[PDB]
Design a protein around this ligand. Structure first.
Ligand SMILES: Nc1ccn([C@@H]2O[C@H](COP(=O)(O)OP(=O)(O)OP(=O)(O)O)[C@@H](O)[C@H]2O)c(=O)n1
Ligand SMILES: [Mg+2]
Ligand SMILES: [Zn+2]
Lengths: 65, 249, 16, 438, 227, 689, 49, 227
RNA sequence: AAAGAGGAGAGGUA
């Protein structure tokens, strides 16, 4: 695939750096992943080939732009 | 694979029911027990993106448990990266390790963002590095950059760029410990370098050449540099080029 | 004490 | 993550340089580049370790050619001491102490000669290369390989007066093997019997402070602690720059030269600020400490400071008591189980000797107050009662030395001291060890 | 025997260099190492190219080795000339003349390399000139293989008319190879070979691979007639 | 163990020559168990004696019936060690001889000496006496080597060492598997199970040999002939030998080619890289035998029966059984195969009684039995080599309450693989991490690939340099076909005895073979070595020799374990412990400290409740995972309730209370042992529907 | 007894006993920390304060 | 590109192996290693051969049994017959039969394979029999390359009471090579390669060299077309 | 539908 784990590591590091607490951002990521999984499970099929946690990391890093 | 097929059973059953529609749980269990080739294709993608926790028996500090990303191997032994051995205090002469699997999404997020083994760089006891090369990497880097009065073939040659020296070395035309001059513009530190210009030569049109023990600099009339050459060894060039290249990717 | 009864510890992600 | 270019290191690269490079990379780029840099360095080292073809041989272990004369001088001194004891001029304790000191000094001189010979003869020897590059070995094992084993210790921790005068390349005798069995037993008993004390200590430490958690941001306190360097006489054992990293100042810091202010009140200290403070004098600094926090819980975020694993201020909700307990209790337990790595040799720690560089006469001073004294080797000397200065005059060179209180002097005023002669001795301290019955 | 070759990615750099990646699969358990090593050894040292071998600079003082009006001395000019890339279409040597006057920046596009020799990169920096300065130079090219060093003349020479330089006739700049698993399912051992080639520009990676393969085939052909 | 002091774990001066000072356990009972020395013996009172030779004026009388002495008899005499050198086995040379007097080491002139020890190796035990060049090693490594020499596995075709010590034949003989000829005659009959000897007079002697038997540790005991028919033998000659002996000598390992250099990271920390020739040439291949048992009891409801008619099983599961229902000899079995088919007549009552009573009244008797037959466990396979059946009416003493016993023996062959432990006699151990094809290994100027590559970094750190002596002597021994034997403490004849001996042997081998590359003068022990992947020589010559290596009983096949869900404990309702019963791994309090220091609270909470003993949350979590939904929040673990009941049993009033939110109303006690949700709570997690 | 000596001296020197207790405890704390750190530094162990 | 290959020495050991030495010259500066390492790698791993893969003995059904009157047990006999060297002229498998009775030394000379299979060494020791003993055996022969381990997956019990063996098809025992300087006065760096082959006996060294050269040519040919 | 319950000794490996 075009998405390697190195990019996810850099994105996670960037998410950690631009915040005041690591525990708070961990909780936010967990909440977003749960919401995304529930949305997937009740409608359509979506690009299921990515875990919800990775999806949440990707959207949260893209929102930084 | 024998451990992985047992530690991840409910996820494999769920993926067998959802995709590649089988029927019910009993058929999936029969398929798993009979060892159909499809279950391995399912397991290869069940475990992708799921962290795992590794532990060694005497846990003296918080670095004795760490999270990794697994890949399936053939055999009956666990493979470990050499750079994390000193933190675990483990060598390959009889030791054993324990493996644990998180279940919920919160646990997976915590394992990825708090305990992943690529983010543990400094020591909580003292803010010193903990992932330094240890036994044979140190010996190789020492042999690469050492000195050798003997075996000096191709000494005195001149090069441009740091890649010409490497290319000439790969052809066998220069030795590994020879003394060569290379054109380099940047900050350089040497061992035993004299801060006083050993020779100064002033030429016409306001130019000056200053020669040190390991350097040769050309300057205009109280102005900027024009060139700088460094006297070094091909192995040191290899080391510094590797370090410089690694910091751009 | 939260370990013995099985609750979230008041440190880390279970702070609040 | 960018904007800093690496320097060209034109030198030999041992473990210390690699650690410095790793620290620099983490400080300047982040925690994601450091992993790839370490991976690349590991790959390069692995690739070029096998090209060299490093091996070990019997003829690679070089023994200095001046061992026999050193041994002969040692035996002459020991025989003099034993004759003196037999005549009836000293007791048994003084004889034991004298022989122990003589053998320790002989071993020290031998290992110095071994290192000098190894460095001068061939710098590409495999043993030298993989011992003094920081790869696996240490000096105490090369000493036994190519020097001499020395004195042993029994399981109770006491010294045996019969030394082993051979090394492993030459081969031991039956008596020396019997003697080495005692060190082997000492290590075996130490590994599994003494490890319970460290575990008990760390369990107690964990229990005493399991509820210290960061709950407050600031307490508003002007109290603090004074921090300076750790020295022993005129030698600095721990500098002040290492102790100030990650601490918050309780008061403004002023340069003793000008009116410039290096830091304000309530400012954390990074590496560069600590280096600037040390370089410009400054012997004491007042900092915020958890010993003086006024928080009505455990500690506040401002009185704690940095978190050493992340190189920044702590997060709210950290369990720092557990970290403190398992940071204190780990190294002792780990070191208890590594005793057998050196056999059972006795780790020497001798007194400090002052020697005359060149011949001359002794002038002494005017505040010199001394008393007759009997040393631990059975000798008559002088014990000092106050600090003074010793003046040694020569043909064209005059030197002065400072003598502190409590040290012993072996010379008087007007004597003709030869070259390389002992003048004074500072004995070892009794602290850092537990006192028992006699 | 029963393998396939594919080309994955190709680029062209700013300096007109070229890059190529090839995938070969499937092979027997150990054949990838032999194929890759033989290809690398033949590619890096057994191909023909052109290079500048002799130069002559007019208006040179034998002391201080400095050209009047030019910000660089002889050493830098000689180092910059050695990196010039040429491609000749004839087996006989040719000569080239360069004459530049006035304030200008000399470039490889200002060399008259006959009617057949071509300059791959016409943006190669050589030297800079100021007012009242002129540069007159002569260059000679040849054929050869590998990195040919010269005797007694590292770089710094200022004496005879035609200066002799140590040359590098190497169309291929870098070669890497790797072997990976291609089992697919559960069966005997199968591997796949990945090969990366960096070429200086006068050749394409596919052409270099074809030439190396032809050379190896010609090498190994006459050994099967002994039985 | 608890009430033992500390003076009992030390070495006393009276132990010399009577108790070995090296061989001892390395656990909690270190220093409390010892081994008898080689030359020691016990008299009729219970005290230990040791022998000595007497000297007269300075001459050792080596033909005067050595004197055995006790610890208190020799306290008042000057006794010399066994390394004192004599001119011609006569007068003592030198002028200063070390002696023991009044339990103290002293020195004296060679005329006041009274007794001399018989041997320099009189101070050590049997296992420690099989290590050559032992005086150049560390004592701890000698202890480790002695310990590890007793964990070796007998091999298919053993080999005796090229470099020995001289004690192997006696050690092999004094243990009882070597058969020797008692007369001076000829050989009349040889067969794989019988040997006959006919003497010159005319009488005959017959011997039978063991064949593939089982030991206490599931190893193999086997005897094979050595002689041929019509051969002429002598007295004391060996005619047969055991599983772990060569022709009269102990043989535990094999001699293989070794080089000391690093590979591409596969020798990182005491790991081992080997070649593929060690696999397909059947080196380090062993045989193991296991036993399985079954019995037929008599319950109060009715006796159980061994039969073939197993209810509710396919026909493919009964191909190999015969008549009675016992597996046949010579069959190949895998996991799940049926060895002995046993059926139990049991009347369980778990169905509505209407159908059962109707069938009983109508008749049509059918199978009301259960199947609990004997099956091979998971991870086992092999050949069936022996089946033994014991019953009544046959003069057999069966256990009371039983009617039949069946025993089955299964044999297996094992080869070396990644994850197995190897070691030598000098305290060097390692784990195999890679197996290479022979075209990738380094090769010699002869063209011969190597067998094993060892990291040199571990030689000076562990301080065991006798292996280099051993390898350099084995190289010459192989090149000469000589099989030398060396006695420890050989420096009493010179100053550099071992080095000079090795150098002389190597030079002689170089002269005899005619190959100049086998020995070098600038680098005595080093040879040039080439790379099998590229064909390029390495920068410097490396050390090459022949090493004697062994394979230990710690094999990775008996160490891999995993669990998802299994049995639980009766009281605490926590997972069981143990490999043999599908047990879980313990999460101690140190790991809890580490997880608290990290800050991961959800991981710890899920570990403590859902995965261990929350009887209701286990099934909810399992079914939520299966259905792909979220995992509900946990409740209260069972151990807390057990503790509360135990505390209340001691007449203590302990309870949990809920705070009053408002008003004057007092706090209300909470009932912990009550059901909150109207859902089932079974004993084990299950897949619903 | 060092604590007792400090308490008596500071109680006589100062007015109240709150400040005296604070001063005595501070001095004893500093002494204990320095002693422990020195004992640990005697070996090759490095720990933050 | 054009060179001469010649055979210098050819000798036979005790009817159980062959030796050959070849000289190849002239070559370029560094092509000796390139040719020699490839030849060694191909010779040692990528050649086909014949071996015995199955044995049937009357009266025995597993490998841990004994026969009355035979000095060896089944495991030793299987090990002895595993290392028997044969050469087959046809790709199809054959079946060989043996029957010996009485006091005898059973060697390999009394195995009847038929005119499609030839036995190389007829003095291969197999077993010994006393007076009242008989030995009856059947052997199977197949083609393959390398090392093959037994698999217990053929549920179709066609090989009833047949005892399977681990198979080794390697007809080349040892390979060595060296490079010498063939320069004669003139400095041109001309190489000469000397190669030595020790062969099992079923193949002559010339045939092995020809097969290796053919394999290498077939490997390196399909790379000359595009890339 | 079923299926192991604890305890005590002795010996080993990180
Ligand atoms: N009573 C013991 C014995 C051993 N260990 C553990 O096992 C390790 C022993 O490692 P081992 O391989 O036996 O020795 P090392 O000191 O590693 O030396 P080497 O491997 O070089 O022999 C100890 O460090 C410790 O982690 C322990 O915890 N308690
Ligand atoms: Mg270890
Ligand atoms: Zn505070």
């Amino acid at each position: 695939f075009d998405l390697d784990s190195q990019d996810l590591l850099f994105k996670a590091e960037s998410l950690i750096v631009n915040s005041t607490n690591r525990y708070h951002v961990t909780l936010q990521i967990a909440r977003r992943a749960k919401q995304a999984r529930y949305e997937e499970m009740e409608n359509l099929s979506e690009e299921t080939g990515i875990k919800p946690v990775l999806r949440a990391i990707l959207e949260m890093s893209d929102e930084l732009n | 694979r024998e451990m992985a097929i047992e530690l991840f059973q409910p996820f494999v059953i769920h993926r067998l029911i959802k995709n590649h529609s089988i029927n019910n749980i009993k058929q999936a269990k029969k398929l798993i027990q009979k060892n159909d080739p499809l279950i391995w294709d399912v397991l290869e993608e069940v475990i992708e993106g799921h962290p795992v926790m590794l532990n060694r028996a005497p846990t003296l500090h918080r670095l004795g448990i760490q999270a990794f990303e697994p890949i399936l191997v053939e055999g009956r032994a666990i493979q470990l990266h050499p750079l994390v051995c000193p933190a675990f205090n483990a060598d390959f002469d009889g030791d054993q390790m324990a493996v644990h699997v998180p279940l919920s999404i919160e646990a997976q997020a915590e394992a990825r963002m708090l305990m992943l083994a690529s983010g543990n760089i400094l020591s909580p006891a003292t803010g010193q590095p903990i992932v330094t090369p240890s036994q044979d990497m140190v010996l190789g880097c020492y042999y690469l950059t050492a000195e050798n009065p003997g075996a000096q073939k191709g000494a005195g040659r001149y090069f441009a760029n740091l890649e010409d020296a490497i290319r000439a070395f790969e052809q066998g035309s220069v030795d590994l410990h020879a003394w060569v001059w290379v054109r380099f513009d940047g900050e350089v530190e040497s061992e035993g370098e004299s801060d006083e210009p050993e020779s100064v030569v002033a030429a016409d049109d306001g130019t000056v050449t200053k020669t040190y023990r390991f350097r040769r600099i050309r300057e205009t009339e109280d102005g900027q540099r024009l060139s700088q050459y460094v006297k070094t060894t091909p192995g040191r060039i290899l080391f510094n080029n590797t370090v410089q290249t690694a910091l751009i990717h | 004490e939260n370990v013995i009864i099985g609750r979230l510890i008041p440190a880390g992600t279970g702070f609040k | 993550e960018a904007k800093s270019a690496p320097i060209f290191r034109n030198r030999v690269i041992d473990k210390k340089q690699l650690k410095k490079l790793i620290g620099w990379t983490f400080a300047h780029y982040g925690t994601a580049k450091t992993a790839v840099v370490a991976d690349d360095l590991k790959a390069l080292g692995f690739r070029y370790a096998t090209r060299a073809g490093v091996s070990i041989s019997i003829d690679d272990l070089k023994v200095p050619g001046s061992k026999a004369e050193l041994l002969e001088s040692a035996e002459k001194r020991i025989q003099e001491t034993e004759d003196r004891y037999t005549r009836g001029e000293i007791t048994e304790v003084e004889r034991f102490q004298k022989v122990i000191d003589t053998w320790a000094n002989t071993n020290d001189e031998l290992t110095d000669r071994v290192v000098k010979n190894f460095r001068e003869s061939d710098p590409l020897n495999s043993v030298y290369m993989m011992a003094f590059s920081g790869a696996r070995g240490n000096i105490s094992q090369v000493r036994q390989l190519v020097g001499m084993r020395g004195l042993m210790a029994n399981p109770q921790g006491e010294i045996i007066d019969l030394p082993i005068k051979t090394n492993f390349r030459e081969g031991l005798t039956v008596t020396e093997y019997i003697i080495s069995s005692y060190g082997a037993r000492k290590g075996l008993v130490d590994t599994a019997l003494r490890t319970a004390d460290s575990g008990y200590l760390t369990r107690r430490l964990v229990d005493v402070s399991q509820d210290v958690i960061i709950h407050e941001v600031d307490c508003g306190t002007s109290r603090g602690l004074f921090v300076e360097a750790m020295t022993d006489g005129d030698r600095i054992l721990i500098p002040i720059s290492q102790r100030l990293l990650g601490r918050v100042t309780a008061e403004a810091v002023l340069d003793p030269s000008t009116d410039e202010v290096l830091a304000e009140a309530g400012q954390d200290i990074n590496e560069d600020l600590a280096n600037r403070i040390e370089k410009a004098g400054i012997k004491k600094v007042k900092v915020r400490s958890p010993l003086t926090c006024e928080a009505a819980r455990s500690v506040c975020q401002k009185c704690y400071g940095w978190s050493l694993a992340h190189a920044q201020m702590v997060d709210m909700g950290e369990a720092v008591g557990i970290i403190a307990a398992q940071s204190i209790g780990e190294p002792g337990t780990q070191l208890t189980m590594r005793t057998f790595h050196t056999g059972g040799v006795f780790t020497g720690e001798t007194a400090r000797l002052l020697r005359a560089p060149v011949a001359g006469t002794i002038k002494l001073g005017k505040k010199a107050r001394t008393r007759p004294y009997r040393t631990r080797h059975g000798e008559e000397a002088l014990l000092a009662e106050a600090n003074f200065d010793l003046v040694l005059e020569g043909k064209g060179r005059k030197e002065t030395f400072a003598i502190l209180q409590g040290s012993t002097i072996f010379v008087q005023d007007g004597d003709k001291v030869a070259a390389e002669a002992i003048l004074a001795e500072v004995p070892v301290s009794g602290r850092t060890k537990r006192t028992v019955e006699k | 025997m029963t393998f396939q070759v594919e080309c994955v990615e190709s680029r062209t750099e700013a300096d007109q260099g070229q890059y190529g990646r090839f995938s070969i699969e499937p092979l027997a358990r150990g054949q990838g190492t032999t194929v890759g090593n033989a290809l690398r050894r033949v590619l890096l040292s057994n191909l023909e190219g052109t290079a500048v071998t002799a130069v002559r600079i007019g208006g040179v003082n034998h002391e201080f080795a400095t050209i009047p009006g030019v910000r660089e001395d002889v050493l830098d000019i000689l180092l910059n000339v050695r990196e010039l890339v040429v491609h000749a279409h004839s087996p006989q040597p040719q000569i080239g003349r360069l004459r530049v006057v006035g304030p200008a920046t000399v470039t490889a596009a200002d060399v008259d390399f006959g009617p057949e020799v071509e300059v791959i990169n016409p943006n190669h920096y050589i030297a800079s000139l100021s007012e009242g300065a002129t540069l007159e130079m002569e260059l000679k090219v040849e054929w050869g293989t590998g990195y040919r060093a010269i005797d007694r003349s590292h770089d710094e020479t200022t004496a005879l008319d035609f200066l002799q330089l140590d040359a590098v006739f190497m169309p291929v700049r870098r070669v890497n190879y790797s072997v990976e698993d291609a089992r697919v399912g559960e069966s005997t051992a199968i591997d796949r070979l990945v090969l990366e080639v960096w070429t200086n520009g006068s050749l394409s990676p596919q052409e270099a691979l074809s030439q190396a393969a032809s050379c190896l085939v010609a090498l190994f052909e006459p050994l099967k007639n002994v039985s | 163990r608890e009430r033992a002091g500390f003076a009992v774990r030390d070495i006393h001066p009276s132990h010399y020559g009577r108790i070995c000072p090296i061989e001892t356990p390395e656990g909690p009972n270190a220093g409390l168990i010892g081994s008898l020395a080689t030359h020691a013996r016990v008299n009729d009172y219970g005290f230990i004696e040791t022998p000595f030779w007497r000297v007269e004026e300075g001459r050792v009388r080596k033909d005067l019936a050595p004197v055995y002495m006790t610890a208190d008899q020799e306290d008042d005499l000057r006794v010399a060690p066994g390394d004192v050198a004599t001119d011609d086995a006569g007068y003592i040379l030198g002028t200063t001889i070390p002696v023991r007097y009044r339990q103290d080491f002293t020195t004296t002139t060679p005329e006041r000496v009274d007794y001399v020890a018989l041997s320099p190796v009189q101070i050590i035990s049997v296992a420690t006496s099989l290590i050559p060049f032992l005086e150049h090693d560390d004592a701890n490594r000698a202890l480790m080597g002695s310990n590890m020499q007793r964990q070796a596995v007998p091999l298919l075709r053993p080999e005796r060492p090229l470099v020995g010590t001289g004690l192997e034949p006696q050690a092999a003989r004094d243990s009882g598997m070597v058969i020797t000829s008692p007369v001076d005659g000829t050989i009349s009959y040889v067969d794989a199970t019988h040997i006959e000897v006919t003497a010159d007079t005319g009488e005959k002697y017959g011997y039978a040999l063991q064949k593939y038997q089982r030991s206490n540790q599931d190893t193999c005991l086997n005897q094979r002939p050595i002689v041929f028919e019509g051969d002429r033998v002598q007295r004391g000659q060996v005619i047969a030998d055991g599983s772990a002996t060569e022709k009269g000598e102990l043989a535990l390992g094999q001699n293989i080619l070794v080089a000391y250099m690093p590979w591409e990271g596969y020798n990182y920390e005491d790991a081992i890289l080997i070649s593929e020739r060690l696999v397909y040439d059947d080196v380090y291949t062993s045989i193991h035998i296991e036993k399985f048992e079954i019995e037929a009891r008599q319950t109060k409801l009715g006796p159980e029966e061994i039969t073939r008619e197993i209810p509710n099983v396919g026909e493919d599961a009964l191909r190999q059984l015969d008549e009675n229902g016992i597996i046949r000899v010579g069959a190949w079995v895998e996991s799940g195969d049926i060895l002995v088919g046993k059926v139990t007549p049991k009347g369980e009552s778990d169905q509505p009684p209407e159908e059962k009573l109707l069938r009983a009244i109508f008749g049509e008797k059918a199978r009301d039995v259960r199947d609990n037959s004997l099956r091979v466990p998971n991870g086992e396979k092999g050949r069936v080599v022996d089946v033994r059946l014991f019953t009544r009416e046959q003069g057999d003493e069966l256990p009371p309450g039983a009617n039949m016993v069946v025993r089955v023996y299964v044999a297996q062959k094992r080869k070396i693989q990644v994850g197995d432990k190897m070691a030598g006699r000098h305290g060097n151990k390692g784990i195999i991490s890679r197996i290479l094809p022979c075209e990738d290994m380094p090769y010699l100027p002869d063209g011969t690939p190597l067998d094993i590559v060892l990291n040199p970094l571990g030689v000076p750190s562990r301080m065991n340099v006798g292996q280099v002596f051993e390898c350099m002597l084995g190289w010459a021994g192989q090149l000469l076909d000589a099989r030398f034997k060396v006695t420890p403490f050989d420096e009493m004849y010179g100053a550099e005895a071992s080095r000079l001996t090795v150098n002389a042997k190597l030079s002689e081998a170089r002269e005899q073979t005619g190959q100049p590359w086998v020995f070098s003068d600038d680098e005595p022990g080093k040879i040039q070595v080439y790379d099998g992947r590229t064909g390029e020589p390495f920068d410097r010559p490396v050390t090459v020799g022949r090493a004697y290596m062994l394979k230990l009983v710690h094999l990775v096949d008996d160490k891999i374990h995993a669990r998802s869900t299994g049995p639980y404990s009766l009281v605490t309702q926590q997972p069981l412990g143990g490999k043999a019963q599908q047990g879980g791994q313990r999460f101690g309090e140190m790991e809890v400290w580490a997880l608290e220091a990290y800050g991961a609270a959800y991981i710890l909470q899920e570990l403590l409740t859902v995965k261990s003993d929350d009887m209701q949350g286990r099934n909810e979590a399992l079914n939520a995972i299966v259905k792909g939904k979220a995992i509900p929040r946990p409740g209260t673990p069972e151990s807390f309730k057990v503790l509360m009941r135990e505390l209340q049993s001691l007449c203590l009033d302990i309870a949990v209370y809920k705070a009053s939110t408002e008003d004057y109303e007092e706090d209300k006690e909470v009932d912990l042992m009550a059901d909150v949700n109207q859902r089932r709570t079974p004993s084990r997690p299950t897949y619903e529907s | 007894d060092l604590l007792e000596i400090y308490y008596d001296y500071f109680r006589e020197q100062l007015g109240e006993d709150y400040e005296a207790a604070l001063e005595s405890l501070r001095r004893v704390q500093a002494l204990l920390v320095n002693e422990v750190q020195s004992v640990y530094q005697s070996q090759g162990i490095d720990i933050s304060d």
